[PDB]
Amino acid sequence: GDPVAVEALLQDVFGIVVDEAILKGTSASEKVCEWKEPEELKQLLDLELQSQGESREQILERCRTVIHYSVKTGHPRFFNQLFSGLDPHALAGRIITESLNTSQYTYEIAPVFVLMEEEVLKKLRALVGWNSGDGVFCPGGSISNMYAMNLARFQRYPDCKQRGLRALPPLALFTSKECHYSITKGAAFLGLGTDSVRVVKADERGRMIPEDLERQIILAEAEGSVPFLVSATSGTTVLGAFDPLDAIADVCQRHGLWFHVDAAWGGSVLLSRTHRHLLDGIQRADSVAWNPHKLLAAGLQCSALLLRDTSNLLKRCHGSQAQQDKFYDVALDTGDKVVQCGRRVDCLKLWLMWKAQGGQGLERRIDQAFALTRYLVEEIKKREGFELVMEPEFVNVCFWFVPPSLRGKKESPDYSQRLSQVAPVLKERMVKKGTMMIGYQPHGTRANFFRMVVANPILAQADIDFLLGELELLGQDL
Amino acid sequence: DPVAVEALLQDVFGIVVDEAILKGTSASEKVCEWKEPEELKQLLDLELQSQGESREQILERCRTVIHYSVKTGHPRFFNQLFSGLDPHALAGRIITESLNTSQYTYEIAPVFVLMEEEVLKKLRALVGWNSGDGVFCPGGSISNMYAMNLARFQRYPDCKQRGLRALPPLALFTSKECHYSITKGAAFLGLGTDSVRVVKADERGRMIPEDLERQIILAEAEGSVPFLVSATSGTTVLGAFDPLDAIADVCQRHGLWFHVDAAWGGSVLLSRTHRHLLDGIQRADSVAWNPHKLLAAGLQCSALLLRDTSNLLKRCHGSQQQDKFYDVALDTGDKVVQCGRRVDCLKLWLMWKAQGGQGLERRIDQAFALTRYLVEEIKKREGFELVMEPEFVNVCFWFVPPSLRGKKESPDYSQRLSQVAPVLKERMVKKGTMMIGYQPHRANFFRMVVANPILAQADIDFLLGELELLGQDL
Ligand code: NA
Ligand code: NA
């Protein structure tokens, strides 16, 4: 409780965070990762909790250690996930949130943030194209899609809330083959079962095929299942595709189906007049999942769920059966909207950055990410040994690195099997060297290829010249 | 510009220290700065615009957001089950937000992939298990939804693929003092609220094993298949603790999943004195435990522990070679249904390292002690009436105003008293001297929570003296 000791502690800890985590964490001169084999890091960390406390110095050193051996996700050469970058205003928002440590649950304990969330959700709905609606923030995009499924099930068969799924006919939902696994996880968690997820084929560019969607819908109807929801993707996690929302909307409307748009990754594109055409027709959706923590670098878990409904379907669905004595408009309380009880404050980090950058500052960051995606594509097409998997529609640049030993050997019967062995070796070498982290995955018959993500707001051409030169160095003997 | 970033955050942290941490823990300051919703909207000027704002305007927005927010760490904040500001946990939280990674793979979160297991390993130890599984979740409501789902999958693994229509009607059982997340989770998981069979609670708010087993037998007679029993070791209102060793016996006789919702009261396991309240918890299949509530770790410290050592957690929430260059068993992505997951272990681990097991024991024991002092002063003071003897740190009590003292036999005494707490709540919130919760159950009564680590007897003398002041004309 001693205030002077507390301030001195937090100020000392903040100095280590600033120097070692923020400044040194975003410097290209430092490493992205200080690799240690698990057991060696176990010993280095000395994690075992004990009965006796430790001195101030031993804790501050545990901070320096935790920072040092952690990956620097805000590094200009961190391309391993869909998120990248460390916005200082967002960080300022994050710190204020953790210090106030409240629950986004009632106006009584979170008055500022209960209103802030309403405004932010109102702006997001505007960028979607709605002048009215409902919505909530959720802990991750996976939960935003489970809400959408559940809301569709309840909107069509409200008895499900009480009698359960055994009182309903078999239900069928539809999503692209390029979806995030959160649809199949949510379907089983919601009791529908993985079989209830009918996969729709994607075209050459990774976009759902509206002709096959209805073909699936009609077949599902013929098997006894009842179509109720369609999930399009506006920014797949691998290729960065954008499903045709206006063509899928037509299909949903022709069958009176819930139209949900998983825009967790690509929904942030709606802030740029230049590239927002990629989500044309999204205003015809019933629900939209949108994670500004990915592209705008707001920090996890910035995950929103927007709804076009204006009848409190959200409260009637996730509400309970239990005030009439409180001294304020209880419409501000959002407890009946979610199935959670306590909920973090996830709007401040986004709102504060948005206040500092302005709508313009965030547009340029999106435009600046698309611009650098062109530069990366330029260098891949100009450089030998780098082969683009496909033309990128987003900031996801998928590409192989063909080492010298395989260039020209495409007609070899085992060309695929050996080329698939290249990225795993290049990934291991870059992590242990600590120079960069790039993701890679197989995609069906396609061999292990990289997946760059041009999203870090401090990225520069020099970083793309390095990672491309770095791969050439690390794969010269392959 | 590195210097601009450093100078920006350093200036922002100065505002956080003064207004949020120091002034937030000062008893001379207010707990809440009440503003009518419409006024606060205009005051805050939340509307987002095309043009950004200057550094000066941002720093001013920080102080304003802090000023009008509630001070959950104030010595006179008793509105929720959480209260207090552990500085070590706060340090961990800031380190967490700055490194901004996902508790998903050892590749991107090597330090925390190990840290979390050790913490979860210590929690399983305090439960009484030398082995098991577990993960952190975003709130205890999700910890109970996972537990429900794990039981459904463990008994009927075909459910994951074929759904609930491929299964017989399922029935779960819980006390009338359960968290409402049970009825929500049951509906969210597709079982339906009717699948939740309510069991009667005794005079102390505790589940009655005689009624539990009676319901189970009725469920079997109606065609349903009992599969799970959800006990509570620290209800949200009264602070009850179900008899875990008696319910375990019933679960044992019917081969049912025994889950213990210890989100609130699980922290008692750190005190040798008071851990007898959870005897039999080592006989559970699963246990939900939130260190953010009592220990002041900060939301969302909510764990889900398992006695299972057969990777039931991955087989249930997983997704269905890759060639990665390290033991992929370290990755915990298949354990949860989320994809990216926050790091919630550092704040607890750092505090536990600084306080030691003894320092955290000291806090729990001192919370029970201060809870007794509150009960002492309530029984000695006129106008304060205890609802029932508290077994935890939840002290439920009425305040009978002077106009109702001695009039207990009036036919409308109860109705008149139920109108007292709502007015005392409004007057304390608009005055800003303290925030105490109250709930309906006979008549609206208060629910103190002796959890703030910096609480003192002077604070208990104030809230009792303050209530008398706010209700002298009622
Ligand atoms: Na090329
Ligand atoms: Na009394």
Swiss-Prot record, chain B:
UniProt EC number: 4.1.1.29, 4.1.1.11
Entry annotated with the keyword Lyase: yes
Residue positions where N6-(pyridoxal phosphate)lysine is found in the record: 293
Keywords attached to this entry: Decarboxylase, Lyase, Pyridoxal phosphate
InterPro entries: PyrdxlP-dep_de-COase, PyrdxlP-dep_Trfase, PyrdxlP-dep_Trfase_major, Pyridoxal-P_BS
BP term (GO), one: taurine biosynthetic process
Catalytic activity annotation: L-aspartate + H(+) = beta-alanine + CO2; 3-sulfino-L-alanine + H(+) = hypotaurine + CO2; L-cysteate + H(+) = taurine + CO2
Enzyme class, first EC level, given as a word: lyase
Pathway participation: Organosulfur biosynthesis; taurine biosynthesis; hypotaurine from L-cysteine: step 2/2
Cofactor: pyridoxal 5'-phosphate
Summary of activators and inhibitors of this protein: Activated by Mn(2+). Inhibited by bis-carboxymethyl-trithiocarbonate, ethylxanthogenacetic acid and 2,5-disulfoaniline. Not affected by Li(+) within 0.05-40 mM concentration range.
Pfam families for the chain: Pyridoxal_deC
Tissue: Expressed in kidney and liver not detected in lymphoid tissues and lung. Expressed in kidney, liver and brain. 7 and 4 times higher expression in kidney and liver than in brain, respectively. Low level of detection in skeletal muscle. Expressed in brain, olfactory bulb, liver, skeletal muscle and kidney with the highest expression in liver and lowest in skeletal muscle (at protein level).
Domain of life: Eukaryota
Keyword Manganese: no
GO cellular component, one term: cytoplasm
An MF annotation (GO) of this entry: aspartate 1-decarboxylase activity
Function: Catalyzes the decarboxylation of L-aspartate, 3-sulfino-L-alanine (cysteine sulfinic acid), and L-cysteate to beta-alanine, hypotaurine and taurine, respectively. The preferred substrate is 3-sulfino-L-alanine. Does not exhibit any decarboxylation activity toward glutamate.
Family: Belongs to the group II decarboxylase family.
Subunit structure, interactors included: Homodimer.
Protein name: Cysteine sulfinic acid decarboxylase
Organism name: Mus musculus (Mouse)
Annotated gene: Csad
